[PDB]
Every structure is written in structure tokens, then in C-alpha cells.
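Q: Structure for this?
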Amino acid sequence: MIGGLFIYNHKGEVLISRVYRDDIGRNAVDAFRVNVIHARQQVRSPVTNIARTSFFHVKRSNIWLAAVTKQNVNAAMVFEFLYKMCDVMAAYFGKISEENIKNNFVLIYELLDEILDFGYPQNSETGALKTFITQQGIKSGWRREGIKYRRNELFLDVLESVNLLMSPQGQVLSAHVSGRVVMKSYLSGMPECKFGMNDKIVISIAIDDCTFHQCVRLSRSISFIPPDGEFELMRYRTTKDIILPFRVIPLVREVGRTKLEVKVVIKSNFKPSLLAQKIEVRIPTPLNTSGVQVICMKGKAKYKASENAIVWKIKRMAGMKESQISAEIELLPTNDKKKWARPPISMNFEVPFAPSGLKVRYLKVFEPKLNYSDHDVIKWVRYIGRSGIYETRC
Amino acid sequence: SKYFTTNKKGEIFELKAELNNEKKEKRKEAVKKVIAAMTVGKDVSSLFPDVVNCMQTDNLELKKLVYLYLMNYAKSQPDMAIMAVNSFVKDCEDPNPLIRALAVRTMGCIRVDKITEYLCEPLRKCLKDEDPYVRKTAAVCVAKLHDINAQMVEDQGFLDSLRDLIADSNPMVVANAVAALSEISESHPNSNLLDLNPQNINKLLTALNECTEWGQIFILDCLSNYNPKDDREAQSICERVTPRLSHANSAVVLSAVKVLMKFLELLPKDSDYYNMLLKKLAPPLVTLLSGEPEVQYVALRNINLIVQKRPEILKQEIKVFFVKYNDPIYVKLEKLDIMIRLASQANIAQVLAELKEYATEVDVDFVRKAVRAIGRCAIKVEQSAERCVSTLLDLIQTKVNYVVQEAIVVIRDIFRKYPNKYESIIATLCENLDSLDEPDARAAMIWIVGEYAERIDNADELLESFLEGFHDESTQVQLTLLTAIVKLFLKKPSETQELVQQVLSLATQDSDNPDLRDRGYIYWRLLSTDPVTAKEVVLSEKPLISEETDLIEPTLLDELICHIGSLASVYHKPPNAFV
Amino acid sequence: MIRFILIQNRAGKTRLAKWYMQFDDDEKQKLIEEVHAVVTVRDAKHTNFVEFRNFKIIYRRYAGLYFCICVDVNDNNLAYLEAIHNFVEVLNEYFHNVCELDLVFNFYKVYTVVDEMFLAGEIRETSQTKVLKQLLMLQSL
Amino acid sequence: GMRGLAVFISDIRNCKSKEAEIKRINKELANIRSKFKGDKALDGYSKKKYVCKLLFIFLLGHDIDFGHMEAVNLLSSNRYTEKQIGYLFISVLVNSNSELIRLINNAIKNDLASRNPTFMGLALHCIANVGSREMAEAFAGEIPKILVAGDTMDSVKQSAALCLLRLYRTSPDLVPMGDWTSRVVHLLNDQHLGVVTAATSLITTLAQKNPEEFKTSVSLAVSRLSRIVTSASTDLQDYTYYFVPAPWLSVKLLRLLQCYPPPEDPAVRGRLTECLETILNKAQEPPKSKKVQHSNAKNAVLFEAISLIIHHDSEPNLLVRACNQLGQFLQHRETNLRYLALESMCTLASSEFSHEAVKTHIETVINALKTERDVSVRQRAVDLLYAMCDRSNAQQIVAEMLSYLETADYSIREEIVLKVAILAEKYAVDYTWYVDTILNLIRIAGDYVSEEVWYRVIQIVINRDDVQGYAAKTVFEALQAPACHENLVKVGGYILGEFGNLIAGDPRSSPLIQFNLLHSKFHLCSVPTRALLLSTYIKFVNLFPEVKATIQDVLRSDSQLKNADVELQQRAVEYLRLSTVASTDILATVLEEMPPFP
């Protein structure tokens, strides 16, 4: 009745597997590792159906548990069994961590073979499994007092910068996002704020980083006391599951050694209801360039001899669209050598969403002495995604 | 070539040597290392025979870890494990029947066409054993054998044995065979599931109070397929099923609810039992929502259908479905949908007191959906439209961007539902005109300006402000701008001749869109043809709209109610959709 | 030129790492993990010339071992592939049918060999005979 | 001779948990630091063993924050093994103690002052591997004198040349252009080939920025290349790798020649042309061994020669022969050879002398793309096809890409359709071909076509088509499949509504059948498609008075009048009132000839 069970780490590598019915191949494993673990804009739901296959997933700390089926299984069965088995594992070796899985592979295999037979969750009381299992688990100052304001207000700003280096064929060579959250709070008294956020943040070569303020308390949730005025709450750098707003496709044709043709097509890979503004595309041209004739149906294009590049300016663009610029370049044959080494095409833009996928879930403000609560406070939230070094090789 | 492949001073030779030792103390560690290496993807086929030689031992652990590797290799390389059945067959006569059960399970885990000769014979001899666990494992592997495509002439004998196994004094065993029969009946021939109603039902209802946690689930799932025939029998079955409020969070409770709601047919008010049962069905559903978030999500998906089929059960229990701040989003959305489902004319004053609250929080998705729910309330209850419009005006006045855009989009629908009732609101909307960035909000604003053109004297300037950046805009805003300007012309002629000419020139010539050009010509060929017929054609009365969005197909609803517990009720799709 | 040289196993444990450019320990670990992930996915039918960040990787498989050289985009591919094979041949000749444990237990000698053949990110010596003679003379001391 | 370390690896491998490993390494670190900090004097052999153990601990992954003092003291020892261990430790782990760095500099200076070649080699390797600013400022003036001294050993010469390379790469402002350049150039004539290799690398890097000083090396380079390629099987046996004479040195020499303009001396150019012709002729010969390494070693030099020929671009016969060889490589078992040959021909695609030669391989390129399993080879083949597309072969190439689209992978489909659209727009000679190609592209892959392409195709169909019947028939035939989708439905609705009268004569395209097909497509699409189809329906009412009634009951249905969308409701209401009110002659006035695009 249960097709099979899988246990994944946070990075997306399968820690362990156990398949009980042959109607589920490694394609299902790849589909779970792609569509659910590495989802970008997929709506979260415990039960997901893809390719006529149902996956029920439960997250414990940074460990994923997935039950895979292809039939019309009792939905509550799967989740109750998952909770019971997690409780059994916790009873056997305490907290559930990747190291504990690595140490007790054998006990995990024994338990999965024992409590689950062909998908049928037989009687699996934790007390009664002692007889059937012969193995033993291996266990292992910043805010002044007396603040008053006429009205309560706060602003949150999630400011992010995306950096991308892309190959001409579309392979993502590198990409990373550097972000910070800025809180500007006019609150009266000594408030206590609980900040709750989703799982897109885990707690030269870009590597994942997360650094909080001095007032942050961890125990999920982040509890703090906002200092008056504006302050930086947390800063971070992320590298996985980045959302790239734009895609640039260059096509360069070298007609002999005298002429050149450059056609650049840009595509907007975000929702149709969002709008990117102040877009600028910098297209390099060879040093020995006599002149260029450029035509484009969106924005305006101009040639800069001092900088030796074509600047294409678009005031704004919506999502899921396309645009094209075509330039014909005439070259004077000074030297028939020193081939034009093509530098990457540069992009600058501004998007009203966080490219890293971050989204603030809730912010509860409680005051013990005074009477106001989060209902009284007025809250603004703004997301500002921007381009850092956004380069596509041409 | 064979570079780095040598096995003279490598770890493979050391592992092979270590498996040939007669000391179990090092043998257990060697087997654990082999298992770990196989888990990491290493090729240990060359070490397979030695592990086979490890199976000839008396110690319990060594055999258990060996069978674990055999099970690992069964799915990986079935062919290699196929030939090892000659040692598995000679293991059903020893004491300690748990070893026999393990061997039977492992042998059934192999999928080989010729394995039946080594599989059919032992099974017929294992159902008659002192230990009921052997019979339990046999009942489990019967389904696995049935999975293999074969004639199975002895299927009649297998079904007879399974049916005879039900009438057994000893509890999880029978509530494993009932599940096996339920699985077999999933591929039901023309003559299947013999209805031995009296004895089988009496035994099932007698063992129901003594089965394990999953035993009740299996028995209830099997019983839900049955169709009663007597009103007194139906009353007895319902009375026997109601005490299912067990410690199992949902599965037992949800299955009991499914059985009771499917077994719901009797006189309306001839006996005071229908009311009692409807009253009893509320506390379990209400207490379902206190579990883990996933189980909450399943319970809410089922409660949606329960409310759809019969709203009398949860009529006054809307206080439970309010949103907590720390809940996951997929539970918040379902709670909102159920809240809108139960909104009667009595509790709006409190429901609307919560939805407005939800529009003052940080989560943007929930804020947009809460404003949309405020809109849906005013179309379901005709006595609260003024209150809903007041709430929407307040949410517009709070000056937040994503609140304002959704509020305007919703007020458009409310206006379309109740024409010529909120003309005075228009001015208050206009001041909040510069913060419209979505195309839906701009389209709604332009449509509202187009309507009630006589009630606004400033509409001409408002549309002249729009015409300047006619391009670089979505197609829907251009279309609604055309329609609004043409409607404005037909109400205020002799003063807007510049507007219509400008907009028709922009749509006809500058825009290359095919259908937009078609509409530009269609409008142009009416205004210049005759202004009498054009006014009747464009400004004709538009029929009203009912709230058909919040409805389901009755046949689909009945099928889903028949399948409350399963995944059919979670996706709200027919079972044949996914196979 | 050459950026780094890696000798790795299938499980991900790095057996040898030689770096010819400035990096930090965290950056080095990230690059090692990325190289392992890129090389492992590819099958035997694929090419050995795999792009990686703004460089490329020339890699070869020997049983359960992976030999990787990271070079610039414009550098030659076949020459460095044959350099990899020549290095492996000299390792085999010097260690008398080399195995993974030979590299594990003699990391400093492997570093001496790698310095003998690759220096400053270029190819230093190519002859197997002269390299073996120098190594034998050094071992004789 | 280190049994303790040897058992250390076994003991650490025997650890069954992370805690055991951490405890063992912490205990060993405590032992090492206690022994160093102790007052008891311990021999240098113990120092070597413990420094090696610390190096092993560091290479395991954990950090080391001490032990530099003993390692730096090891350098002054007279035993080679201890010196090598110390230098390895210093190269692997770098410390920021300025006095320690200065002491290292002094010790390396003392080792350089010695006449032992091995110690000088170790010092040079340390300088090259570390390459810090202090080492540069200390030894920039000292290294070239060691390189150019006539009594130095060959190994020291190679190491010194590469060290000067490293210092130049890391510290370009601290290395002046002195009078040692002549000796560096003359090094190319040394009998030891490794010296030639090191000199070639250094000269290549330096001449990448300073051509005038090293411009005199071209004659020596071509002479050595001629000697290498004309050698027999019994010559240069020391540097011969699998029956190939000196692959890496020849590759380096060709790379060196690539960064210079063509030689001024006609004799030098003649010798170079002879060398290139000899290499190509030897390449056309059958292989002398079944081992793949001989093939790779020969192919490396072959591809370098081809790249040099492309770079110079002055010999038509060489270009033709290179094109022939590259075309031959497409029919090869190895994927690497196909990849490299595709890259090389794509480079040739921008050359004046070889357009026809590259064009001749069009069938081979198409076959390779069709029978290809690797994605990268497919992408490079597609890029080559786009690169060599001209007026004559435009139709063949576009047809090939369209035929590939049906079985193409989804990842490449976007690139293919974009390139097909660009080619069709660029090389459109006959409007019938362009319209047919665009309609086929839409019918195949409309999920990846933009919104400008099917605006342009309809604009051309309206303005000057004379293929309106042809346009309508193709759409009518294509719309009859169950897999029809958004863009095809939209363009088909427009085309049918505008021009159904031209194909309504045929019994297979009667107006009722057209309307039935369109309405079958109707209830499956989004709202802009449905609005377009409603405009199509009002067009049908005026074109075909026989079907008007059947159309009207479609509008009056509750699915249109009470539709939640504003635009669909407005269109339905307006069209229904337009058909019902006025008269039939009034309707024909609103739906006239559709004047063409501007």
C-alpha cells in the first residue's frame, strides 16, 4: 500500500532508500529530488502528484522523509505511519540527524523491513519491537527605556542582489545572491517581536552565509527587540534554487573579416503581473569599429566610442515577454589579426521580488506593559531584487 | 585498460579474506562494512558468494544481517538472488518461526517466473501453524504473489484459505487478511467479494474493538464498500461504528466518518436518531484540527466535502476555523475557504471582523486571498454588501499597495453584481489612482471609469492621462481602454471627438495586434455608420451574474463522499484521473 | 595554464589536491565538492571536457578513481588529457602497480612527483625515463 | 621508515564514528604539542615524523595552528628528506609571522647560494608554489642570474624558467626587462628538450605582452619544429610518447608561433609551410598502433597546427586540407574528436577562403546532428548549421531543423525555434515558403514561439500574400489534430474567420464543419483565445448566412452572457446585439474587407 520510502539530506542527496514495489523506478527518485526538494515556485503541499505518482513528505530538522505511492492510498494512513516511525526512531536514538542516520544505517534498514511489510503497517508498538529487533542503537543594552511615539509603525525591506555568469548555450556557469533585511521600526515602549520565515535560508567562490544582529535570539522563529530607528537585522548569501529574472541569447555572425552582425534576444522569466524597471544591456563591440547601424523595437540603443559598446535602455518590461535588438557593424581592415576576443554582455535591472525565493511569513509584536499588539501596529513589507554582475557570454 | 583495477594489495581482497573467517565477532563487522559499501554504491558482486557462505551459521544476528543484504540485492540484481532459493527453501522446518516468516517474506520479495515452484508449495503449508505470525506474513505475501502475472489456477484455493483465515480467535492477523482481501478486490472480476453478510459482519464488528490501530482502519475501509439492506441493520451498524473516537488522530476517525456518512439513509424525523447522529458527528471533526499540520490539511480537505454534502453538521462551529498566526500556509488557505463556506447571514458581523484583521498582516499571499474572501462574502450574503464595501474602502484608505490593488479588483466584481447602488464611492477610488501597478487593477479602474460616465465629470481627463503611454501596456488594459472610451463617447458626444479619434488611431494603426485591430475597425464601423444603432449595441443592459464559482458537480461530490478517506478527496479529482 | 589538480574517489574523499592559484579553505572545499558533483553525474559515453565556472575540466576515470585538471577555456584539451595519462603511467611505474592505499600512505612522494612534472601551472617534464631516473636518484639518498 | 604514521592511517580508518575520529585527532594533537613544548631535547628525525603527521592531519580536513617553528628549523638540516618535508609543510601552510617569513627568505637564499642542484630545485619549487610578495621582492633580481648561468644543471634551468614565469604572472611590476632576454631566446637550441619546453612557456607568456624583445625566436621555433616532425623512429627516443615525437613541445611551439604575425623572412615561411604540410600528410596516414593514446597524441599536434593555420589565414591549400581533415573527423568513434572538429569548423566558418569547403560538409553535419546522443555535440552542430547558412542552402537548412524539431528534446527546442524564425525572416525570398515555414513552426512548437512572429505572419498574409487560399488550407488541415494548442488556435481562428470563403467551396471545408472544429477547440483555451474565437464567429455570421442561426445559439448560452470575465461578456453581448438588431446589410458594413497593415 506504501510504494516505498526515501530519506534525503538538506543538500538534495538521498541518504537512504527502500522500495517495496517495482512499479517505482529511479525516475521517481529524480522527480522527487527535482520537483519537490529543489522546487522554485511550486506551491507547498504535503501531498503532491506528478507523473501519476503521489509523494507524501515530512521534514524533520534538515531531513526529508518521503512515502511514494501510485495507488489511491488512505492519505491519513501515510502521515500517521510517518509520525509513528519518526517517534520510534527518536525513541531508539534521540534526535534525528544526518550523522545518526550514517551511524545507524543498519538499524534503519532493520526497522523499515520490520514495521512495514509490502506497504502494510502491521502492529508496530515501540514496546513490542524490542523482541523482534536484536540490535541496539548508537546514541549521541541596545534600546533605551522611555520611548514614546504617537503611532506605531514598522517597515521591512528585503534587499537582494543576484549575480550570474552564463554560457552562450544557456548553461548556468555560476549564480549567487547576496541579501539583507532592514527593519525600520517606530514602536513605543519595549516591544518583543517574533519573526517567522520560510526555509529558503539555511542557518572568489560564493558560499552560503547567514549573520544576524546582536539582538536576535534563536530557540522556525527569531525573537528580538527592535532598536529605535533603522537597523540591519540579518544578512545572507545563498547559492541554490536561485530565480533568474532574465535570460539573454546572443547570436554573433562574422561575415568574413570586414562586417559583423549581432542579434540579442532577452526574455523575462517571471510572472506576467510583475514589472521590472530600469533595464540596461551593454553589448561590447570590437576596437576597430568604423560604425554600427542598430535597430530595436523596444527601448533605445546608442553606440559609445569612448566606452566602445552599445547601450540598450528599456524603461520597463513585464513578465513572460521577449525583445530583440539587431546591429550591423562595419569594420575597417587595419590589421588582419588579433581576433576580437568577445567580452560578456552586461545586464542591469530591478525586480519587485526576491530572486533568492525568500518570503517573510509573519511578524508578531507583543508589548507586556502597554496594551498594543500586532493588530494596532501598521506594517509595510517591500522586496527589492537587483542585479549585481549579470553577465552572459557572447 | 585495467589501471588501478589490481586486487593484490587492495581493500577488496582484504574484505574477501575477512568474510571467510569463522569468528562471528569479526564477521558481523565485515557484513556491516559490506552493507555500508553497497549502500554507498560500491560493486560487491565479487564478494556475493562469500556472503552466501556466511548464511550457513547458527547465530541469529549473522543470519539477519545476511538476509538484509539479500533483500538489498533482490531489488538491485534480482538475477543473482534468484539462484539462492535452494537455501531458502530448506528453512521452513526449523524452530523459532520468526526465521521461517523472514525467509518466506524474503522469498516472496523475489520476482522470478520459475520461483513459483519454490514458492507455491511452502505457502500452502505455512497457513496451518501454531504461531499466528507465520499466517500473518503468508497473508501479506499472498498479495505480492498475486502481483506477479500468472494464470494462478490455485487462486480459488488461495481465496478459500484467506476467507477461512478470518474466523480465527487470534487480532492483528485477521485485520491483515481483511486488508489483503480488500487489495485483491481492487481488481474485481464479474463475480468477486462474496456477500456472506451475517457471519462475516458479526465477526468483523466483534474483532473491531480488539484490533490494533491499523486494524480498525482496514476493517472500516473494507466495510465502507458494503451496501446495507435493512433500516434496522443500518441503525445497528451506525450504532456500532459511532464509538470510534479512538486515539488514532485521523485515519480511524476519518474512516468512521466515511462509513457513517455513506450509511446515511433513513426517515427524516420519524425517529430521533438522525438528529442524534448529526449532533455526534461534530465533536470528532472539530477535534481533528488539533493534530500535526499535514493531518490538519487532510482533515480540512475532507471537511470541505462534508460541508458541501450536508451543511447542517457544522452550522454553528465557525469559531474553530479561524486562522492562527503560526500555521502553515497550506492550512491557512483551507481554513479561509471553509470560513467562507460557512458564512451565513448570522455570523458575518464576526467573520468580517476577522477577515479585515487578516488584511493587516505581513504575509502577502494571505493578504491577497483575505481581500478576495472579503469580496466573496458580499456576493454570498446580500444583507452585508454595505458592510463589505465599507471594509474595502477602509482597506483602500490604509494606503498599502498590494491591499489597494486587490481591493479595487474586488470592488469591480461587487459593482458588477449590484449595479446602480454605489455611485458615490467612485470619487474615493480616484484619489487612489496613482498606485496601480498590476494590470488587473488598472483594467478594473478603467472599466469602472467607463461605467457611470455621467456620474463622473472628470473621466475625460482621467482617460487622457491613460492614452499617453498607450503602448508598453498589456493587451487587456488596451482593450478595456478602447471599450471605456467608446462607451464614454456614446454618453458625452460633441465634446470627446478628440478622444475617440486618438484611441481608434492608436489601436488601428500604431498597434500591430491582429484582434486589437479587428476591434478597432468594428468600433470604427459603428460610430461612423449610424449613432442610433451603435448606442443600443454597445450600451445594452448586461445580465447579472450568480456566484457559480463556489460549487461542485453533484456526481463528483457524491463519489468523493464515497471516498472520503482516500487521496480522491484530497485532490478533489476522480480516482481514474491518476493511475 | 593549470588551476588545480585533483585525485578523488567515487565516495567523494579527496586523495590529492594541488592548487596553483590563491583560495581559502572554505572556497577550496566548495570547489572540491563542485568538481566531484560535476564529474560523478557524467557517464562513460560523455566527453572528458566539461565546463566548470569560467574554466574547464579535463578528467579521466581509472577504476574507482578520478583524475581532474582544471585549465583555462582557450587551452589545449588532448595535450592535457595525455599529460594526465602520462602522470598516471609514471605513478604506476614508481609505486609498483600503484593502488589507492599507495597514494594514501605516500602523499609526500606523490607531491614530489607532481612538483616534478607540473610547476607554476605549466608542464615541466614529459619524459618518463628521465623522471623515473630522477625519482630513483632521490630515493637513493 | 615511519611505522607510527603508517599505523596512524590504519587506526583512523578503523574508527567507527565521528566522535572516535575527533577524539583520536585531538589526543594526537595534544601529544604533539606537549612534546614540542617540553624541555626534553628530541632528535630531528622525530621532528620530521611529527611534522609529517601534522601535515597528514591538515590534509584530513582539520586545521593546524602551530608547528611552524620546527618545520622552519628543518630547512637548515643537511639531510635531504628533512629539507623536503620542511619545504612541503611551508608550501602547504603559510604563516603571517614577519620574522618567520624573513627567516624562510634567508634560508632559501642560503640554499640558492649552495651548488647542490637538488637543494636549488627544492628552493625554486618552494618559491614557485608559495609566490608571495616577500619572495618576489627578495629573489626577482636573483632568479634570472641563476637561470642564465652557464654552469647550472638542466633541471635547475627548467625550474628557474618556470619560477620566473610564476613571479612575472603574480608580480609583473617587480620584474624589469633586462639583458637576460638573449640567453632566454638562445635556450631554444639546448640539446635537453625539457629546457626547450620551459623556455617556450616563458617566452610565450612574455611575448604575449612584449613582442619586440622575443620576435627573434621564430626562426629557432620553426627549425626545431621541422627537426621534431622530420625525425625518424630511432631519433629523440627519450621524449617519444607512444610513437609520436615530442607532442607537448610541438604543441607549445605552435602556440608560441600563434601569438606572432606571419614571419617576415620568406625562408622561414617556406619552412613553416613545409612543416604544416608534413604534419597534415602524416595525419592522413593510417594509425601505427591500436592504442588510443597514440591517436590522442597525434591529434593534439594536428589540432594545434590547424589552429595556427586558421590564425595566419594566408594559405588557401592549407585551409582546404584542414577543412577536409575536419570533415573526416566527424565520422569517428570518439566523441572528443567530433567535439573538437565541430569547434574547429565553427572557427573556420568566419574565413573567406574556406566557405565552400565548410559548406561541402553540410550533409555530414546534418547526419551527425541527427544521429547524435551527446547534447554538447548537438548544440555545436546546430551552431555550425546556423553559421554556414547562406542563400543557396537556406531552404535545406531550415527544412533540416524543422524535421529535427519533431523528435527534438525539449531543452534544445527553444534555441532551435528561435534560430529557425531568425533564418526564415532573414532569407525570405518567396512569400509562400516563408508563410509555410512559419505555420509549420507554429504547428510543431507553438509553446516556444513568441508573440511577434505570428503577428508578422498574419501581417504578411494580409498585405501581399496571393496565398490566402494556401494560408487557409494549411491551417484547416493543421487544426484537425487533438494536440493543437494556444498559438496555433489563435492564428487558426484569425485565418479561418478572415478567409473561410476561399476554401468553403471544397466539400471537406464546408462552413458548418469549420464552425464545429473551432467550437470544439473553443472550450479548452484561455480567455484571450476565446475572445479571438468570438470575433471569428461574428465574422462567420457575415460570411456564411446559412450558419447564422447555429452560431447565435452559441452566443446566447449562459456560458457567454454571464461569463465572469468582463471582456468575454462584452464581446458576446455586443456581437449578439449586432447580429439580432439592425439588418443583414448593416452587419456587412461593420465587417468589410479588412484594410491591410501599414
